[PDB]
Amino acid sequence: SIVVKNNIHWVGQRDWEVRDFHGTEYKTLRGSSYNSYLIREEKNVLIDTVKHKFSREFVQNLRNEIDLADIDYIVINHAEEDHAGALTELMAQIPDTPIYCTANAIDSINGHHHHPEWNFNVVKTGDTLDIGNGKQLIFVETPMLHWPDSMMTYLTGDAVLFSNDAFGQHYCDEHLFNDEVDQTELFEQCQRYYANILTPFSRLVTPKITEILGFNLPVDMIATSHGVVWRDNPTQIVELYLKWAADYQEDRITIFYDTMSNNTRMMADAIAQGIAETDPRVAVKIFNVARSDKNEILTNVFRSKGVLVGTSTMNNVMMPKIAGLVEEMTGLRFRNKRASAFGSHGWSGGAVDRLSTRLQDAGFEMSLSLKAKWRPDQDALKLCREHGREIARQWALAPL
Amino acid sequence: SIVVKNNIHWVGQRDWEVRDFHGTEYKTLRGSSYNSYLIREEKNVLIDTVKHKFSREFVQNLRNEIDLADIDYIVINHAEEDHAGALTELMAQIPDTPIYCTANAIDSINGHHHHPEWNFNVVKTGDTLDIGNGKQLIFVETPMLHWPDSMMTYLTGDAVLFSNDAFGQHYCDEHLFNDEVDQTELFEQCQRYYANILTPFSRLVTPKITEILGFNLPVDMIATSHGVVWRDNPTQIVELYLKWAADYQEDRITIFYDTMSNNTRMMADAIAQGIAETDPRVAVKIFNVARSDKNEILTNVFRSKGVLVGTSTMNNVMMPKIAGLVEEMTGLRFRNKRASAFGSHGWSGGAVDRLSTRLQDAGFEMSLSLKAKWRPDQDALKLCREHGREIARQWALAPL
Ligand SMILES: Cc1cc2nc3c(=O)[nH]c(=O)nc-3n(C[C@H](O)[C@H](O)[C@H](O)COP(=O)(O)O)c2cc1C
Ligand SMILES: Cc1cc2nc3c(=O)[nH]c(=O)nc-3n(C[C@H](O)[C@H](O)[C@H](O)COP(=O)(O)O)c2cc1C
Ligand SMILES: [Fe+3]
Ligand SMILES: [Fe+3]
Ligand SMILES: [Fe+3]
Ligand SMILES: [Fe+3]
Ligand SMILES: [O]
Ligand SMILES: [O]
DSSP states (O other): OEEEETTEEEOOEEESSOOEETTTTEEOTTOEEEOOEEEESSSEEEEOOOOGGGHHHHHHHHHHHSOGGGOOEEEOSOOSHHHHTTHHHHHTTSTTOOEEEOHHHHHHHHHHHOOTTSOEEEOOTTOEEEEETTEEEEEEEOTTSSSTTOEEEEETTTTEEEEETTTOOOOOOSOOBGGGSOHHHHHHHHHHHIIIIIGGGHHHHHHHHHHHHHTTOOOSEEEESSSOEEOSSTTHHHHHHHHHHTTOOOSEEEEEEOOSSSHHHHHHHHHHHHHHTTOTTOEEEEEETTSSOHHHHHHHHHHOSEEEEEOOEETTEEOHHHHHHHHHHHHHTOOSOEEEEEEEESSSOOHHHHHHHHHHHTTOEEOOOEEEESSOOHHHHHHHHHHHHHHHHHTOSSOO | OEEEETTEEEOOEEESSOOEETTTTEEOTTOEEEOOEEEESSSEEEEOOOOGGGHHHHHHHHHHHSOGGGOOEEEOSOOSHHHHTTHHHHHTTSTTOOEEEOHHHHHHHHHHHOOTTSOEEEOOTTOEEEEETTEEEEEEEOTTSSSTTOEEEEETTTTEEEEETTTOOOOOOSOOBGGGSOHHHHHHHHHHHIIIIIGGGHHHHHHHHHHHHHTTOOOSEEEESSSOEEOSSTTHHHHHHHHHHTTOOOSEEEEEEOOSSSHHHHHHHHHHHHHHTTOTTOEEEEEETTSSOHHHHHHHHHHOSEEEEEOOEETTEEOHHHHHHHHHHHHHTOOSOEEEEEEEESSSOOHHHHHHHHHHHTTOEEOOOEEEESSOOHHHHHHHHHHHHHHHHHTOSSOO
8 A cells, every 4th residue: 555645545456457448448558547545544434446356456455454344434436347346345344334425326336236235325515524633524526527426525634635537547657646657648648538538528527626616625635546646736637627628629630531442541641731731730630440549539539629530431321430430429529629521432422421410410510521432543632632721721720 | 373274274362361351341360362364265365353462473473374465355343452453553564455344344443543545345244255266255244243343254165154252252272162172161251251241232132143044154163253263063152142142041149239347248148048048949149349350240140030239328329339330230231130229328328229229220120129227136137038038039930
């Protein structure tokens, strides 16, 4: 275990090997960590657990820290398996220990563990739990950030906000604190997490943070459930969340596509050229979805003012990876972004219009599509290059 | 080169390494081959070429066989890049050589190569080309089998049908003939090809084969553009195509899904149990789409009387790989098949109904969906098992 601050002990688990979260929907290229915390004042409090995979290690390590019977309260901020996964193993040893959680957390904890006989204590925003020595926990409900059961726990005096998933990132390191790790790697993982997970709830992020800030509670540290503890200028991640939540976009355009014989790829490259030679301010990224990291594409889409999506026509429909990615984007609800569909066809086509419509359903403000037959010759590539020019002009953040 | 029969020489290319066709839409787990044929009678005829990747090898090997100038006619059955890919390199050496192809082939050849100055000779079904020694080529248009440009070429006397893609398979072997290779491996690759490529055109397969058979032309060999030459009971693959085209289905049910935390997986296994303990005649296959070969899933769907597709709810929509696979199936147009959607959810759900509707759009006759909240307990697993029982009864090919 590691001392976070005073009597706050980190008793979590580092995961250097993990590469997949939520099936394979989230790729963790730098592993992850599952942060659990043990607070030892007059009362002993355990905050969250770890992934079920490491329940054996977690309980044993916890034993080496404290007799399990001396644990007074258990706090569950969020009942997703990577945080509440070792709960069944733990409660088997100390079944009478009270669990403090939201009303929705009873549903989700029971939904995974099927032990409704556990002693649940429903908490609501403003509710407190005294732990002695002039210190208390303050609970803050954060529903749909990102689950119905989600909440945060604040420790007075030490001024530590246990924010669970919020402000966290999948970044495994032997060092605990934000000032002890690589800043570029930390930021990349932070933005990757928000873009792929929190984007659809951005309208909820601002008001909740505003509400939390309105409590006028001091914040020395933010101890999340993933990655580093924020101790040096800890509210920097809070400020990033405020920027990211405000329908964030940079002067950037992301192009991605799938292709069966590279014709649509040729179109994508030509479009990009047209953009770059029209507006030098725009950052351009191109991805073949069949050969790229899906989460990296989505992080870029998050950072972009607009996107161009390409597909050829395959059996009168679009290529499946594009349909899949478009489905997922429809769930992420990107806001204030523009889009244009493009791609090649052999005879009757139809996939480009099909894609243009689904992008619109996904919430993008649609510009005209770009189409070509078979492999683009020099004349066709000119038209693609001109399309990029028209897009760059239409989507310009400022004149010229 | 290899002697196919008499003066027919195989001058193609084996591809032991290839693993992806049409982007990554078709996985070639046993590599492939690109069959090109040189007929040397009074006239010298080249039938098809090979993938562009091997154009250098192809032209050189062809040189070792014959002076390129002594080639009288070039036949292009199909202008997809894996057969017409080396055409530009070849025609650079012998630009005056006539190319015999369908009207649609002019569009597709020019569409890829951009050399419309080439000497094209449009052919239609019944058209002939004398090559001397009492032998002639007979052309047969096969539009949308599987491209608009597709055709077959028949050689009289030797009685060889050059069928291009049709009756072919992606199966690389040093041996040329069907009786010289592993029969189980050959069949598997043959069925994989039809299921993933030809399924949507099945209504066209029967009439065209009936038309071709009506010509009363003898068939000693079927020389396709992929894999083996059929010489021993060659029409066996023709008969298989007739069976496969007739909305083929076995007493088989395929279950596939994606899952973020395995709840839908638990549902799938329980459903399968219910089926197996209700109808022992049914063959059951289960696939996690995130961890499985997509083409294997589709081959099974092709062989199945019905399917069950599972998804959890992810940001109010379905998981992307399921949406992608469903999109692709909508293009393949499976016929006379039944389907049922299932999966888990956390709160409001909606993905299971969303999937049920899209399966219906894909052409499946829909049975009721199966839903569960979070992880299924023993009672929930019973309901899943009962769902399998109800499906088995509904989809029974015969009583009991
Ligand atoms: C398996 C397959 C299915 C196709 N289906 C259609 C179709 O339904 N309609 C059409 O116009 N072209 C169809 N085509 C032709 C392609 O769309 C055409 O080759 C296109 O230029 C390829 O674009 P890409 O190289 O970017 O994948 C199909 C091609 C293949 C290989
Ligand atoms: C990223 C994510 C998004 C989710 N979105 C929804 C949702 O929109 N509606 C809902 O009812 N449940 C939602 N859930 C809850 C899951 O559907 C629930 O955990 C389900 O039981 C998981 O099924 P599975 O393990 O087969 O993937 C979401 C879960 C995750 C991890
Ligand atoms: Fe979570
Ligand atoms: Fe988490
Ligand atoms: Fe083809
Ligand atoms: Fe082919
Ligand atoms: O999580
Ligand atoms: O092909």
